[PDB]
Subunit: 101 residues, 2 copies
């Protein structure tokens, strides 16, 4: 069996020696995001879509692709009892134009 | 089909209204970590193990359970071509005392 204690000790050694990526959020590319988006029957995201979300990205300071990595995560790991704006589900009934209002 | 553009717009709405959790890390319970660990044939982590790692946690400034969440994430989503200390796999040949 894999000794978890050791693996954790090793990760700590990695950090002591300079590693940081596995501690931060990963981000993603449009293409990688879509590979995931498709496993869960989500409409593929186009470059246009990405560019169309710029207003909201400028208003929040959160790069669009960074928000995509967040969605990617929720899709793979779930919300785990946590909600978003009080919802237990990811809402898709509101458009960009809707939210910007 | 689920409109991705709309879902992303919603998350931004959520951020605009104060949401943050889905942007930052996700710490973990020793229990939740173990449910995940066993899924991948890893030794379950005990409270002793956690406490034994305190020296390294103090030297790095990153809590044990936070490192556990990091591991949890690596096991569920993989390393994706990225490496750790040059290795392409999660090494478990070194004990806490080997690292110290």
């Amino acid at each position: 069996t894999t000794i978890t204690l050791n693996v954790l000790a090793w990760l700590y050694a990695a950090v002591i020696n300079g590693d940081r990526w596995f501690l931060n959020r990963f981000t993603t590319t449009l293409n990688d995001f879509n590979l995931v988006a498709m496993k869960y029957n989500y409409e593929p995201l186009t470059q246009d879509h990405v560019d169309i979300l710029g207003p909201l990205s400028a208003q929040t300071g959160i790069a669009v692709l960074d928000m995509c990595a967040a969605l990617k995560e929720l899709l793979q790991n779930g919300m785990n009892g946590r909600t978003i704006l009080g919802s237990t589900i990811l809402e898709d009934e509101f458009t960009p134009f809707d939210v910007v209002r």
